[PDB]
mmCIF file of all heavy atoms in Angstrom:
data_model
loop_
_atom_site.group_PDB
_atom_site.id
_atom_site.type_symbol
_atom_site.label_atom_id
_atom_site.label_comp_id
_atom_site.label_asym_id
_atom_site.label_seq_id
_atom_site.Cartn_x
_atom_site.Cartn_y
_atom_site.Cartn_z
ATOM 1 N N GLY A 215 -10.145 -0.183 -0.699
ATOM 2 C CA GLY A 215 -10.355 -0.146 -2.142
ATOM 3 C C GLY A 215 -11.028 1.151 -2.605
ATOM 4 O O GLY A 215 -11.415 1.987 -1.788
ATOM 5 N N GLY A 216 -11.185 1.307 -3.928
ATOM 6 C CA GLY A 216 -11.887 2.457 -4.478
ATOM 7 C C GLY A 216 -11.014 3.713 -4.431
ATOM 8 O O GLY A 216 -9.815 3.626 -4.704
ATOM 9 N N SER A 217 -11.630 4.848 -4.063
ATOM 10 C CA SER A 217 -10.976 6.147 -4.009
ATOM 11 C C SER A 217 -11.192 6.715 -2.620
ATOM 12 O O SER A 217 -12.328 6.719 -2.149
ATOM 13 C CB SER A 217 -11.514 7.115 -5.045
ATOM 14 O OG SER A 217 -11.044 6.770 -6.337
ATOM 15 N N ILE A 218 -10.098 7.152 -1.978
ATOM 16 C CA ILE A 218 -10.184 7.641 -0.612
ATOM 17 C C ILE A 218 -9.463 8.980 -0.485
ATOM 18 O O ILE A 218 -8.450 9.239 -1.141
ATOM 19 C CB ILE A 218 -9.640 6.625 0.410
ATOM 20 C CG1 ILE A 218 -8.123 6.450 0.312
ATOM 21 C CG2 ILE A 218 -10.368 5.296 0.285
ATOM 22 C CD1 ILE A 218 -7.496 5.762 1.506
ATOM 23 N N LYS A 219 -10.070 9.817 0.352
ATOM 24 C CA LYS A 219 -9.479 11.012 0.906
ATOM 25 C C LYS A 219 -9.023 10.673 2.314
ATOM 26 O O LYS A 219 -9.816 10.193 3.109
ATOM 27 C CB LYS A 219 -10.519 12.132 0.916
ATOM 28 C CG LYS A 219 -10.015 13.478 1.400
ATOM 29 C CD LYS A 219 -11.134 14.424 1.738
ATOM 30 C CE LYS A 219 -10.634 15.740 2.280
ATOM 31 N NZ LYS A 219 -11.761 16.653 2.563
ATOM 32 N N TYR A 220 -7.742 10.902 2.612
ATOM 33 C CA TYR A 220 -7.152 10.408 3.842
ATOM 34 C C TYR A 220 -6.355 11.511 4.503
ATOM 35 O O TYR A 220 -5.620 12.219 3.835
ATOM 36 C CB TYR A 220 -6.224 9.232 3.530
ATOM 37 C CG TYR A 220 -5.508 8.600 4.718
ATOM 38 C CD1 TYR A 220 -6.018 7.474 5.345
ATOM 39 C CD2 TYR A 220 -4.305 9.101 5.185
ATOM 40 C CE1 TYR A 220 -5.354 6.874 6.403
ATOM 41 C CE2 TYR A 220 -3.633 8.515 6.244
ATOM 42 C CZ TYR A 220 -4.147 7.380 6.837
ATOM 43 O OH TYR A 220 -3.503 6.762 7.869
ATOM 44 N N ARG A 221 -6.465 11.589 5.825
ATOM 45 C CA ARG A 221 -5.686 12.526 6.603
ATOM 46 C C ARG A 221 -5.586 12.020 8.036
ATOM 47 O O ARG A 221 -6.609 11.755 8.655
ATOM 48 C CB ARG A 221 -6.357 13.893 6.540
ATOM 49 C CG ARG A 221 -5.645 14.985 7.318
ATOM 50 C CD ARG A 221 -6.618 16.141 7.468
ATOM 51 N NE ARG A 221 -6.017 17.325 8.039
ATOM 52 C CZ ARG A 221 -5.156 18.125 7.410
ATOM 53 N NH1 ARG A 221 -4.767 17.856 6.176
ATOM 54 N NH2 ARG A 221 -4.667 19.189 8.025
ATOM 55 N N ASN A 222 -4.350 11.874 8.529
ATOM 56 C CA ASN A 222 -4.075 11.531 9.918
ATOM 57 C C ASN A 222 -4.916 10.338 10.385
ATOM 58 O O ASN A 222 -5.595 10.405 11.403
ATOM 59 C CB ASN A 222 -4.246 12.748 10.823
ATOM 60 C CG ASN A 222 -3.733 12.499 12.227
ATOM 61 O OD1 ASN A 222 -2.666 11.914 12.431
ATOM 62 N ND2 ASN A 222 -4.512 12.914 13.207
ATOM 63 N N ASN A 223 -4.845 9.242 9.622
ATOM 64 C CA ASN A 223 -5.480 7.964 9.942
ATOM 65 C C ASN A 223 -6.997 8.134 10.040
ATOM 66 O O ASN A 223 -7.655 7.417 10.779
ATOM 67 C CB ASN A 223 -4.884 7.313 11.202
ATOM 68 C CG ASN A 223 -4.942 5.790 11.211
ATOM 69 O OD1 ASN A 223 -5.187 5.136 10.198
ATOM 70 N ND2 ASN A 223 -4.664 5.187 12.353
ATOM 71 N N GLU A 224 -7.557 9.072 9.279
ATOM 72 C CA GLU A 224 -8.996 9.210 9.148
ATOM 73 C C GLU A 224 -9.314 9.302 7.661
ATOM 74 O O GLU A 224 -8.542 9.844 6.873
ATOM 75 C CB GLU A 224 -9.511 10.416 9.932
ATOM 76 C CG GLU A 224 -9.379 10.218 11.433
ATOM 77 C CD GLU A 224 -10.026 11.269 12.318
ATOM 78 O OE1 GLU A 224 -10.719 12.154 11.783
ATOM 79 O OE2 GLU A 224 -9.832 11.197 13.547
ATOM 80 N N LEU A 225 -10.475 8.782 7.294
ATOM 81 C CA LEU A 225 -10.706 8.322 5.948
ATOM 82 C C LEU A 225 -12.076 8.764 5.457
ATOM 83 O O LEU A 225 -13.034 8.721 6.225
ATOM 84 C CB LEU A 225 -10.643 6.800 6.021
ATOM 85 C CG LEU A 225 -10.627 6.126 4.668
ATOM 86 C CD1 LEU A 225 -9.492 6.701 3.857
ATOM 87 C CD2 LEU A 225 -10.469 4.636 4.823
ATOM 88 N N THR A 226 -12.156 9.166 4.187
ATOM 89 C CA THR A 226 -13.426 9.412 3.525
ATOM 90 C C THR A 226 -13.398 8.692 2.187
ATOM 91 O O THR A 226 -12.427 8.831 1.457
ATOM 92 C CB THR A 226 -13.688 10.908 3.300
ATOM 93 O OG1 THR A 226 -13.579 11.603 4.541
ATOM 94 C CG2 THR A 226 -15.050 11.172 2.704
ATOM 95 N N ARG A 227 -14.454 7.937 1.865
ATOM 96 C CA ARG A 227 -14.540 7.272 0.576
ATOM 97 C C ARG A 227 -15.127 8.248 -0.426
ATOM 98 O O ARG A 227 -16.058 8.960 -0.079
ATOM 99 C CB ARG A 227 -15.443 6.042 0.637
ATOM 100 C CG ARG A 227 -15.155 5.136 1.822
ATOM 101 C CD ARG A 227 -15.487 3.689 1.524
ATOM 102 N NE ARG A 227 -15.577 2.931 2.760
ATOM 103 C CZ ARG A 227 -15.785 1.627 2.825
ATOM 104 N NH1 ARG A 227 -15.700 0.886 1.735
ATOM 105 N NH2 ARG A 227 -16.056 1.067 3.990
ATOM 106 N N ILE A 228 -14.587 8.273 -1.654
ATOM 107 C CA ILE A 228 -14.974 9.272 -2.641
ATOM 108 C C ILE A 228 -15.085 8.674 -4.042
ATOM 109 O O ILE A 228 -15.165 9.427 -5.008
ATOM 110 C CB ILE A 228 -13.993 10.465 -2.643
ATOM 111 C CG1 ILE A 228 -12.534 10.034 -2.819
ATOM 112 C CG2 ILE A 228 -14.173 11.307 -1.389
ATOM 113 C CD1 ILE A 228 -11.563 11.192 -2.938
ATOM 114 N N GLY A 229 -15.149 7.346 -4.151
ATOM 115 C CA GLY A 229 -15.168 6.686 -5.450
ATOM 116 C C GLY A 229 -16.441 6.926 -6.266
ATOM 117 O O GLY A 229 -16.447 6.649 -7.459
ATOM 118 N N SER A 230 -17.510 7.440 -5.644
ATOM 119 C CA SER A 230 -18.781 7.656 -6.326
ATOM 120 C C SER A 230 -18.761 8.972 -7.105
ATOM 121 O O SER A 230 -19.612 9.849 -6.903
ATOM 122 C CB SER A 230 -19.888 7.658 -5.325
ATOM 123 O OG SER A 230 -19.585 8.592 -4.302
ATOM 124 N N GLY A 231 -17.769 9.117 -7.987
ATOM 125 C CA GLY A 231 -17.526 10.379 -8.666
ATOM 126 C C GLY A 231 -16.786 10.205 -9.988
ATOM 127 O O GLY A 231 -16.955 9.196 -10.675
ATOM 128 N N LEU A 232 -15.965 11.200 -10.347
ATOM 129 C CA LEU A 232 -15.296 11.188 -11.637
ATOM 130 C C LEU A 232 -14.432 9.933 -11.792
ATOM 131 O O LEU A 232 -13.830 9.450 -10.834
ATOM 132 C CB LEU A 232 -14.445 12.454 -11.764
ATOM 133 C CG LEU A 232 -15.197 13.723 -12.147
ATOM 134 C CD1 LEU A 232 -14.229 14.901 -12.244
ATOM 135 C CD2 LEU A 232 -15.952 13.542 -13.464
ATOM 136 N N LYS A 233 -14.374 9.415 -13.018
ATOM 137 C CA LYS A 233 -13.583 8.237 -13.318
ATOM 138 C C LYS A 233 -12.384 8.678 -14.141
ATOM 139 O O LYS A 233 -12.527 9.122 -15.273
ATOM 140 C CB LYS A 233 -14.429 7.195 -14.051
ATOM 141 C CG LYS A 233 -15.409 6.458 -13.149
ATOM 142 C CD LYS A 233 -16.453 5.665 -13.880
ATOM 143 C CE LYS A 233 -17.378 4.940 -12.922
ATOM 144 N NZ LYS A 233 -18.239 3.964 -13.629
ATOM 145 N N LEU A 234 -11.209 8.573 -13.530
ATOM 146 C CA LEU A 234 -9.970 8.992 -14.151
ATOM 147 C C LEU A 234 -9.427 7.873 -15.029
ATOM 148 O O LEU A 234 -9.744 6.705 -14.840
ATOM 149 C CB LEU A 234 -8.964 9.311 -13.042
ATOM 150 C CG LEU A 234 -9.355 10.431 -12.079
ATOM 151 C CD1 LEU A 234 -8.331 10.527 -10.965
ATOM 152 C CD2 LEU A 234 -9.498 11.768 -12.803
ATOM 153 N N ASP A 235 -8.544 8.259 -15.944
ATOM 154 C CA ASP A 235 -7.777 7.339 -16.752
ATOM 155 C C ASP A 235 -6.316 7.662 -16.494
ATOM 156 O O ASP A 235 -5.897 8.808 -16.644
ATOM 157 C CB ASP A 235 -8.172 7.490 -18.219
ATOM 158 C CG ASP A 235 -9.575 6.977 -18.460
ATOM 159 O OD1 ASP A 235 -9.712 5.754 -18.520
ATOM 160 O OD2 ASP A 235 -10.528 7.799 -18.509
ATOM 161 N N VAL A 236 -5.550 6.650 -16.111
ATOM 162 C CA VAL A 236 -4.193 6.866 -15.652
ATOM 163 C C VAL A 236 -3.276 5.834 -16.288
ATOM 164 O O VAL A 236 -3.551 4.638 -16.277
ATOM 165 C CB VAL A 236 -4.112 6.784 -14.123
ATOM 166 C CG1 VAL A 236 -2.671 6.944 -13.657
ATOM 167 C CG2 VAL A 236 -5.045 7.779 -13.444
ATOM 168 N N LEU A 237 -2.156 6.309 -16.811
ATOM 169 C CA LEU A 237 -1.097 5.430 -17.255
ATOM 170 C C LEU A 237 0.026 5.443 -16.227
ATOM 171 O O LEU A 237 0.553 6.504 -15.893
ATOM 172 C CB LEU A 237 -0.608 5.910 -18.617
ATOM 173 C CG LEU A 237 0.545 5.107 -19.197
ATOM 174 C CD1 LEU A 237 0.051 3.786 -19.747
ATOM 175 C CD2 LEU A 237 1.240 5.907 -20.281
ATOM 176 N N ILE A 238 0.400 4.249 -15.765
ATOM 177 C CA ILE A 238 1.522 4.082 -14.862
ATOM 178 C C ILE A 238 2.772 3.848 -15.699
ATOM 179 O O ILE A 238 2.732 3.117 -16.688
ATOM 180 C CB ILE A 238 1.264 2.935 -13.868
ATOM 181 C CG1 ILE A 238 0.130 3.290 -12.910
ATOM 182 C CG2 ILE A 238 2.531 2.570 -13.118
ATOM 183 C CD1 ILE A 238 -0.427 2.106 -12.136
ATOM 184 N N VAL A 239 3.875 4.490 -15.296
ATOM 185 C CA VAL A 239 5.122 4.381 -16.019
ATOM 186 C C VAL A 239 6.222 4.144 -14.992
ATOM 187 O O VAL A 239 6.496 5.010 -14.160
ATOM 188 C CB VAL A 239 5.401 5.625 -16.891
ATOM 189 C CG1 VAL A 239 6.641 5.446 -17.764
ATOM 190 C CG2 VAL A 239 4.200 5.977 -17.748
ATOM 191 N N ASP A 240 6.833 2.960 -15.090
ATOM 192 C CA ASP A 240 7.856 2.516 -14.170
ATOM 193 C C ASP A 240 9.224 2.922 -14.723
ATOM 194 O O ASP A 240 9.550 2.638 -15.876
ATOM 195 C CB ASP A 240 7.744 1.003 -13.952
ATOM 196 C CG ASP A 240 8.460 0.504 -12.705
ATOM 197 O OD1 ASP A 240 9.547 0.995 -12.441
ATOM 198 O OD2 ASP A 240 7.934 -0.382 -12.008
ATOM 199 N N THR A 241 10.021 3.584 -13.881
ATOM 200 C CA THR A 241 11.377 3.975 -14.224
ATOM 201 C C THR A 241 12.344 2.792 -14.186
ATOM 202 O O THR A 241 13.447 2.894 -14.712
ATOM 203 C CB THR A 241 11.904 5.046 -13.264
ATOM 204 O OG1 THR A 241 11.977 4.478 -11.958
ATOM 205 C CG2 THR A 241 11.064 6.301 -13.264
#
Side-chain angles (χ1 to χ4, degrees):
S217 286
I218 69 165
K219 183 195 177 178
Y220 179 96
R221 180 195 188 72
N222 190 43
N223 209 14
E224 292 188 6
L225 190 55
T226 306
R227 313 209 197 184
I228 54 175
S230 53
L232 280 180
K233 285 167 179 191
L234 299 174
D235 291 283
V236 177
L237 178 76
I238 293 165
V239 186
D240 198 320
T241 64

